[PDB]
Amino acid sequence: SIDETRAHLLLKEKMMRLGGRLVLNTKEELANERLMTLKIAEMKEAMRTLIFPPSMHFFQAKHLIERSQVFNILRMMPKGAALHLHDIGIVTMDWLVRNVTYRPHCHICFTPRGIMQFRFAHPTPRPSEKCSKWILLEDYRKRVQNVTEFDDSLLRNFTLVTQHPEVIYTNQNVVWSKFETIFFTISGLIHYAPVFRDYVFRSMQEFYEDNVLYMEIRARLLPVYELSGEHHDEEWSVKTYQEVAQKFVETHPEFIGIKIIYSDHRSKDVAVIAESIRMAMGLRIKFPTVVAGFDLVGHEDTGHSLHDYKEALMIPAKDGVKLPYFFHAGETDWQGTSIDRNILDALMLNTTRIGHGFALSKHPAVRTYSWKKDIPIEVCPISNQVLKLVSDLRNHPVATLMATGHPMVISSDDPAMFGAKGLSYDFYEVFMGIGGMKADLRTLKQLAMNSIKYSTLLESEKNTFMEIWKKRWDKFIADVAT
Amino acid sequence: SIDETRAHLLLKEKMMRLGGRLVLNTKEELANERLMTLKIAEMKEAMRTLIFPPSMHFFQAKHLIERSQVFNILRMMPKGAALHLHDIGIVTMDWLVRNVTYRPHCHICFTPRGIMQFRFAHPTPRPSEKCSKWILLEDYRKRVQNVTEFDDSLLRNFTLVTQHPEVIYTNQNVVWSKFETIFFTISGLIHYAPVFRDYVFRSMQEFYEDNVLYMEIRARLLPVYELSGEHHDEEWSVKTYQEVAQKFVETHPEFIGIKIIYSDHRSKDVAVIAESIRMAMGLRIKFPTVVAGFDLVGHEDTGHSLHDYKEALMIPAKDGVKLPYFFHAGETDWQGTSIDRNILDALMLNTTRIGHGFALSKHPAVRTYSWKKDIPIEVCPISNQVLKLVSDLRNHPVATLMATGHPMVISSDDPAMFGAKGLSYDFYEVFMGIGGMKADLRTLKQLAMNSIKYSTLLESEKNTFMEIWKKRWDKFIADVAT
Numbered sequence: 028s029i030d031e032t033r034a035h036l037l038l039k040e041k042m043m044r045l046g047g048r049l050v051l052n053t054k055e056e057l058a059n060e061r062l063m064t065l066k067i068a069e070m071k072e073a074m075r076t077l078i079f080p081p082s083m084h085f086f087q088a089k090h091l092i093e094r095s096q097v098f099n100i101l102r103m104m105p106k107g108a109a110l111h112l113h114d115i116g117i118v119t120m121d122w123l124v125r126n127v128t129y130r131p132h133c134h135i136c137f138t139p140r141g142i143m144q145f146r147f148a149h150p151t152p153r154p155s156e157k158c159s160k161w162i163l164l165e166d167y168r169k170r171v172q173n174v175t176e177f178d179d180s181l182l183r184n185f186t187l188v189t190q191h192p193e194v195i196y197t198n199q200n201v202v203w204s205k206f207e208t209i210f211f212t213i214s215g216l217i218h219y220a221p222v223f224r225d226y227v228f229r230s231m232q233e234f235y236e237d238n239v240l241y242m243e244i245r246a247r248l249l250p251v252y253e254l255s256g257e258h259h260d261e262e263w264s265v266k267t268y269q270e271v272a273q274k275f276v277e278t279h280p281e282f283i284g285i286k287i288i289y290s291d292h293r294s295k296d297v298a299v300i301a302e303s304i305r306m307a308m309g310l311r312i313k314f315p316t317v318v319a320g321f322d323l324v325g326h327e328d329t330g331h332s333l334h335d336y337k338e339a340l341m342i343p344a345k346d347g348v349k350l351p352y353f354f355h356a357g358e359t360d361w362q363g364t365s366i367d368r369n370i371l372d373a374l375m376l377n378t379t380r381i382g383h384g385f386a387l388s389k390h391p392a393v394r395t396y397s398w399k400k401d402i403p404i405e406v407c408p409i410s411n412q413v414l415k416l417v418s419d420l421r422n423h424p425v426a427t428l429m430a431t432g433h434p435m436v437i438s439s440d441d442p443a444m445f446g447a448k449g450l451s452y453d454f455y456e457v458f459m460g461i462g463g464m465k466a467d468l469r470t471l472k473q474l475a476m477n478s479i480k481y482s483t484l485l486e487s488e489k490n491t492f493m494e495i496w497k498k499r500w501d502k503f504i505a506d507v508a509t
Numbered sequence: 510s511i512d513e514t515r516a517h518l519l520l521k522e523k524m525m526r527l528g529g530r531l532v533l534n535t536k537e538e539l540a541n542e543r544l545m546t547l548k549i550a551e552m553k554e555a556m557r558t559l560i561f562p563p564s565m566h567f568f569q570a571k572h573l574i575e576r577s578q579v580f581n582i583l584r585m586m587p588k589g590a591a592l593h594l595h596d597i598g599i600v601t602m603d604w605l606v607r608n609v610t611y612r613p614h615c616h617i618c619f620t621p622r623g624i625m626q627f628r629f630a631h632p633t634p635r636p637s638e639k640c641s642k643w644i645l646l647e648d649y650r651k652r653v654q655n656v657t658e659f660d661d662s663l664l665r666n667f668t669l670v671t672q673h674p675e676v677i678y679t680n681q682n683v684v685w686s687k688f689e690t691i692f693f694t695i696s697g698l699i700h701y702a703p704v705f706r707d708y709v710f711r712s713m714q715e716f717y718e719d720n721v722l723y724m725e726i727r728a729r730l731l732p733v734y735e736l737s738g739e740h741h742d743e744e745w746s747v748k749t750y751q752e753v754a755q756k757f758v759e760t761h762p763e764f765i766g767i768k769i770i771y772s773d774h775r776s777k778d779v780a781v782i783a784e785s786i787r788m789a790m791g792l793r794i795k796f797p798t799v800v801a802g803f804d805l806v807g808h809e810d811t812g813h814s815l816h817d818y819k820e821a822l823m824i825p826a827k828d829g830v831k832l833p834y835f836f837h838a839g840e841t842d843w844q845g846t847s848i849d850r851n852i853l854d855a856l857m858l859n860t861t862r863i864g865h866g867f868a869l870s871k872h873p874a875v876r877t878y879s880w881k882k883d884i885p886i887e888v889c890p891i892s893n894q895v896l897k898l899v900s901d902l903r904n905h906p907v908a909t910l911m912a913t914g915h916p917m918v919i920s921s922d923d924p925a926m927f928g929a930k931g932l933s934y935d936f937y938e939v940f941m942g943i944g945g946m947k948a949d950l951r952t953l954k955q956l957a958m959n960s961i962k963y964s965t966l967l968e969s970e971k972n973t974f975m976e977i978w979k980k981r982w983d984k985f986i987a988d989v990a991t
C-alpha cells in the first residue's frame with residue numbers, strides 16, 4: 028500500500044509532464060523504445076564522466092552535440108514551426124563571409140572606435156563622420172598576405188562564438204554590447220537589396236533542411252538600399268518577404284511560408300514607439316495575411332518596461348482596433364522587479380505569445396493566469412545560456428513548467444550568432460537538459476504539435492499544416508523504429 | 510477592471526509567498542520600511558553595476574556581503590534554530606590552526622599519496638601502514654623559514670576557499686574529492702577528547718553569537734580518543750554532547766541546547782548500514798532526549814540510493830519501532846533519475862524533514878505530497894553554490910518554492926568549509942538572492958519561526974523556545990526601527 032502510494036505519485040508525474048497524456052501507436056512505441064535506449068545510454072555515460080553537453084557552454088558543447096545519436100534523430104524529426112526568430116540571426120554566417128563579401132561593389136570600413144562595417148556602393152562612398160575611408164574589399168584582399176586568415180577574422184566578427192566565453196564575456200552587459208555590435212556590423216551587408224532577397228531565401232532553405240516547415244520572424248524592417256543610393260520603406264520589405272516566401276513555396280510545396288512580427292527597439296522614447304504602433308496597424312491593413320502583429324526587442328534589463336510604454340501600446344484599443352502582440356517578457360534573472368513584471372503586463376495587454384517568460388515560474392499567479400488563457404511561452408534555451416541567464420541548462424526554470432505540462436513552444440531566436448542552425452540544437456537542449464531523463468517521444472510530439480497550434484495561421488491552415496506534418500511524422504517514426 | 514485584474518494577481522502573489530499572510534504590528538511595519546529601504550538601495554546599485562553578491566561565487570562575494578547594511582541587520586536578527594548542520598563543519602577553521610594545532614602532543618604526518626593527517630599522542634606513535642613518520646608540530650614548526658607561512662598553509666588546507674574556484678574545481682567530483690579530504694585531514698585534530706569537548710562548546714559559542722539558540726547536528730559519532738590511544742564509543746559521544754550542551758546552557762540560559770541525528774556514509778554496504786540502524790534504535794532508547802533519529806550522508810550522485818537501502822531502513826518497522834528519519838535527498842542537478850527519486854523515497858519512509866530537496870520543484874506530485882504532510886525542506890544555499898549545483902543563486906530552484914510558501918527552514922550545512930559562520934550568510938543569500946526583491950520582514954519572521962516549529966523538541970519546549978525567541982525578536986525590531 029505504501030508501495031502503491033509510490034507507484035501512484037510516479038504515475039501522476041508521468042501523466043502531468045508535457046505530452047504525458049498522449050496516446051502512441053505500436054510503431055511509435057517502438058520508436059520511443061529505441062530513442063529512449065540511446066538517450067539513457069548517453070545520459071549514463073554523462074553521469075559517469077560529467078561530460079554533459081547541456082551543462083556546458085554551448086560554444087564548447089556544440090561539437091559533442093553533433094556526435095550525439097539523439098541529436099541525429101532530432102535533426103530528422105519534423106519539428107513543426109519556428110515561432111521565435113529575429114530577422115538577421117537566422118542564416119549561417121559562413122555564407123555572409125564566403126559568398127556575400129565576395130560580391131561586386133562590397134566595401135569594408137572601421138569606425139573611430141574600431142567597429143567593422145560594410146557598404147555596397149558605386150563609386151566608393153565619400154568619407155563620413157562614422158567612416159574615415161571606405162575600401163573596396165577586392166582591393167583589400169589584393170593587399171593581405173594571407174586571405175584565408177583575413178576571411179576567418181571576418182567570420183569571428185559575425186558571431187559570439189569563442190573559446191573561453193567566461194573570460195571574454197564577464198557579465199550580461201558585455202555580452203549584450205558584443206551582440207548588438209554584431210547586428211551593426213553585418214547590417215550593411217544584409218540590407219543591400221539583392222543580398223536581402225538572397226538572405227530571406229537562404230533562411231528558408233536552412234530551416235527547411237532542418238525539417239522545419241513554417242517561420243514567424245520578428246523583423247525591424249530597417250531600410251533596404253540600392254547601389255543607386257535609393258532606400259526602400261517598410262511596406263517594400265514586407266512585400267519582398269511575401270514575394271521571396273511565395274517563390275520558395277513554388278519549389279518546396281510542403282513549406283507553409285513565413286509571417287512577420289514587426290518589432291522596434293525598447294531603448295526608444297514612447298512617442299517614437301507610438302509611431303511604430305501606427306505603422307504596425309497600417310502594415311496589418313496592407314498585409315493581413317503576412318504581418319501577424321507587433322513586439323518590442325532589445326536588452327530587457329536596461330531598456331524600457333511595457334508599463335513605461337502603456338500609452339503607446341493602448342493606441343490600437345483607443346482606436347477600436349485589435350493589434351496582436353508577441354511581447355518578449357521576463358527575459359531576466361531578477362525577481363520582484365519592474366523587469367519580471369513585464370510578463371504580467373504582456374498578459375494584461377492580451378499578448379498572443381510570451382517571448383522567453385524565463386521569470387514565469389517565480390510568479391505562480393501569473394503562471395496560472397497564462398495557463399488558463401492558454402498563452403504559451405516561447406523558449407529559446409541556447410539564447411538564455413549564451414546571454415548568461417543560466418549557466419547549466421539542467422537549472423533552466425522551464426524544467427518546472429515542463430513537469431506540469433505548461434503551454435510552450437521551442438525556438439532558436441538568433442541561432443547564427445551562437446553557431447547553431449535551425450531548431451535541432453535547441454530541441455536537443457530541451458529534450459536532454461531541461462526536460463530530464465523521463466522526457467520521451469510524447470514530449471517531442473507535443474512540442475511539435477504546439478508549434479502548429481500556437482502559430483497565427485487560420486484554423487483551416489493549421490489543419491492543412493497538421494496533415495502535412497503528420498505524414499512527415501509517420502516517415503520519421505518508421506525510420507527511427509527501423 | 511484590467512487595472513483591477515493586475516492588482517488582484519499581484520495581491521495573490523503577495524499573500525501566497527512565504528510569510529505573506531503574517532500580520533505585522535506597527536513597530537514591525539516601521540522596521541520593515543527601514544530594512545526594505547536599504548535592501549532596495551543595495552539592489553538598485555547591483556542592477557546598475559551587475560556586482561550582485563548572490564550572483565557571484567561566495568568565495569568572491571563574502572567580502573562584499575560583510576559590507577552590506579542588510580547583512581548587518583540579518584546578523585542581529587534572532588534566527589531561531591540551525592536544523593541542518595554536520596558535526597565537523599561548524600567551527601571557524603582559524604581556531605583549529607591558531608589554537609588546537611598549538612596544543613601539546615599534536616603531531617602531523619602524510620599518507621603515502623601525500624594527504625595530510627593529524628594525531629594527538631603521548632608518546633609519539635610507531636610508524637604504521639597509513640603513516641611512516643608521525644612528527645610533533647613543535648619540532649616541525651621551527652624548521653620552516655616562515656612559521657606564519659606554514660600556519661596559513663594549514664588554514665588554506667582546512668577550507669575550500671580559493672581565488673578562481675572555476676579553475677581549481679572544474680567539476681562536482683573534483684570539489685567533492687577535496688571536500689571529503691578536508692574531513693579526513695581535520696578528523697584527527699577534532700576526535701582527541703579534550704579537543705572534541707572544546708569543539709562542541711565553541712560551535713555553540715559561534716551560533717549563539719550569531720543569535721541562534723538551538724542546534725540539531727548530523728553526527729557520524731566517530732571514535733573519540735585519548736592521549737594513550739584508548740578509543741570511546743557512540744554512547745560515550747552522545748553522553749559527551751549532552752554534557753557539554755548542559756554546561757553551555759548553564760552560562761547561556763537563553764540557549765535551548767542541541768540534539769543529535771546519528772548519520773552514516775552512503776558509500777557503505779547495505780548490511781553495514783543495517784548495523785547503523787540497530788545502533789540508532791539503541792541510542793534512541795538510551796538517550797530519548799538527545800538523539801532525534803538517523804540520516805545518510807555523503808555525495809548523493811555517486812553513492813547508494815535510499816531504495817538500495819530499503820532492507821536496512823525497514824528494520825525498525827519490521828521490529829515494531831518508529832525510527833525518525835531526516836534524509837538528505839535530491840541534492841542533485843539530475844532530473845528523472847534514481848538520484849532525485851530519493852526525495853519520493855525519503856517521503857515513503859516517513860522522513861521528518863528533507864535535507865536540501867534541491868530537485869523538489871521538478872516533481873510536482875512529490876511537492877504536493879510533502880506540502881500535505883507538512884514535511885519541510887532544509888535549504889543550504891551557500892553549500893549548493895560552492896558544491897556547484899547552481900552558479901547564480903538567483904536561479905536557485907527554491908525561489909519557486911518560496912513563491913508558494915512551501916514549508917522550509919534555512920541552515921548552513923558546513924559553514925566553516927566555505928568561509929562562512931553561523932546562519933547569517935545563508936539568510937542573506939535567501940533574502941537577497943533566492944526570494945527576490947519582494948521578500949520582506951514577514952519572509953524572515955516566518956523562516957525563524959519555522960525553525961522552531963519543525964524542530965524535534967517537545968511541544969511544551971517549542972512553546973518555551975517561542976517565548977524566548979519572541980523577546981529577542983521584539984528587541985531586534987526596536988533596534989531596527991530606531
Ligand SMILES: *[C@@H]1O[C@H](CO)[C@@H](O)[C@H](O)[C@H]1NC(C)=O
Pocket residue numbers: 143177180181183184
Ligand atoms: C575582426 O576582424 C578584425 C579585422 O581583421 C580583426 O582585427 C579582429 O581580430 C576580429 N575580431 C575578433 C573578435 O576576432
Ligand SMILES: *[C@@H]1O[C@H](CO)[C@@H](O)[C@H](O)[C@H]1NC(C)=O
Pocket residue numbers: 126127225226229
Ligand atoms: C552565392 O549565393 C547565391 C545564392 O544566394 C548564388 O548566386 C551563388 O551560387 C553563390 N556564389 C558562389 C560563388 O558560390
Ligand SMILES: *[C@@H]1O[C@H](CO)[C@@H](O)[C@H](O)[C@H]1NC(C)=O
Pocket residue numbers: 340341344349350375376377
Ligand atoms: C484586451 O482585451 C480586453 C477584453 O476585450 C479589452 O478590454 C482590452 O482593450 C484589450 N487590450 C488591448 C491592449 O488590446
Ligand SMILES: *[C@@H]1O[C@H](CO)[C@@H](O)[C@H](O)[C@H]1NC(C)=O
Pocket residue numbers: 623624625665666667668669687691
Ligand atoms: C590540501 O593539500 C592537498 C595535498 O597537498 C591538495 O592536493 C589539496 O587540494 C588541498 N586541499 C584544499 C586546499 O582544500
Ligand SMILES: *[C@@H]1O[C@H](CO)[C@@H](O)[C@H](O)[C@H]1NC(C)=O
Pocket residue numbers: 029822823825826831832857858859
Ligand atoms: C511509515 O509509516 C507507515 C504507516 O504508518 C508504516 O507502514 C511504515 O512501516 C513506516 N515506515 C517507516 C520506515 O517507519
Ligand SMILES: *[C@H]1O[C@H](CO)[C@@H](O)[C@H](O)[C@H]1NC(C)=O
Pocket residue numbers: 608707708711
Ligand atoms: C584556546 O583553547 C580554548 C578554547 O577551546 C581556550 O580556553 C584557550 O584559552 C585558548 N588558548 C589560547 C592559547 O588562546
Ligand SMILES: [Zn+2]
Pocket residue numbers: 111112113355382440
Ligand atoms: Zn528574441
Ligand SMILES: [Zn+2]
Pocket residue numbers: 593594595837864922
Ligand atoms: Zn548536509
